[PDB]
Amino acid sequence: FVNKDQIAKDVKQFYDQALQQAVVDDDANNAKAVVKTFHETLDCCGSSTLTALTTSVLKNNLCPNIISNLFKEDCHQKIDDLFSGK
Amino acid sequence: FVNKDQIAKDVKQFYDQALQQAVVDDDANNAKAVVKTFHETLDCCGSSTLTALTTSVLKNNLCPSGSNIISNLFKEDCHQKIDDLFSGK
Ligand SMILES: [Mg+2]
Ligand SMILES: [Mg+2]
Ligand SMILES: [Mg+2]
Ligand SMILES: [Mg+2]
Ligand SMILES: [Mg+2]
Numbered sequence: 708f709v710n711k712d713q714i715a716k717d718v719k720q721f722y723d724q725a726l727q728q729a730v731v732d733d734d735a736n737n738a739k740a741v742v743k744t745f746h747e748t749l750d751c752c753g754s755s756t757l758t759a760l761t762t763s764v765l766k767n768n769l770c771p772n773i774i775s776n777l778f779k780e781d782c783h784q785k786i787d788d789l790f791s792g793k
Numbered sequence: 794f795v796n797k798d799q800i801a802k803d804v805k806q807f808y809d810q811a812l813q814q815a816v817v818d819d820d821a822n823n824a825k826a827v828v829k830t831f832h833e834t835l836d837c838c839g840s841s842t843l844t845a846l847t848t849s850v851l852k853n854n855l856c857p858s859g860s861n862i863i864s865n866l867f868k869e870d871c872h873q874k875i876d877d878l879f880s881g882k
Contacts, residue, residue, distance in 0.1 A: 709807040717803065721795045721879070740881030748834060748878060789834060790807070792826025 715790045719783050723757065730763035739769060746770050749785035752777055801879045805872050809842055816849045825855060832856050835874035838865045842872065 722745055728738035742764065746752055752770035753761025755778045764770060787793075808831055814824035828850075832838050838856035839847035851860060869877075 708810060709803050714803050714807055717800050721797065721800055724795050737881065744878060744881045789830060792823055792830045
């Protein structure tokens with residue numbers, strides 16, 4: 708079987724690495740599109756565990772309310788909710 | 794190391810497992826909730842590995858309001874939407 712907690716953990720890692728890659732290297736095709744899609748699909752922006760990357764991602768219009776829940780319902784929370792059925 | 798291919802495979806399997814339980818187990822509140830969340834979040838209904846099941850999935854009200862046999866035929870399946878999520882499309 709696929710364990711919920713493990714796949715949620717793996718997806719959060721995928722998102723985190725993408726967030727990092729999205730701000731570290733700029734004017735690049737991959738990382739920013741992945742991030743934008745996660746943000747639009749899950750309705751979130753950044754991660755409470757990565758505030759500096761979250762700031763960079765806000766400054767660079769990679770996020771679509773969202774602000775009211777910026778860290779109350781961050782992308783890690785939405786990923787958990789996806790696999791938990793919330 | 795994060796492995797995009799393997800994560801996508803595991804998400805698809807997770808969905809398929811939940812869908813299969815959702816149609817056969819009446820007390821599977823979690824499985825039903827999982828598939829309903831995937832369907833709403835990814836804007837899909839059913840998978841390409843379980844095409845024959847889509848009729849029961851709909852009858853079971855596991856797809857978002859408006860979903861019906863014909864409307865769903867003009868939509869990508871959940872596996873493609875899962876692939877799209879991890880490829881940024
Ligand atoms: Mg490149
Ligand atoms: Mg949700
Ligand atoms: Mg269940
Ligand atoms: Mg389940
Ligand atoms: Mg949605």
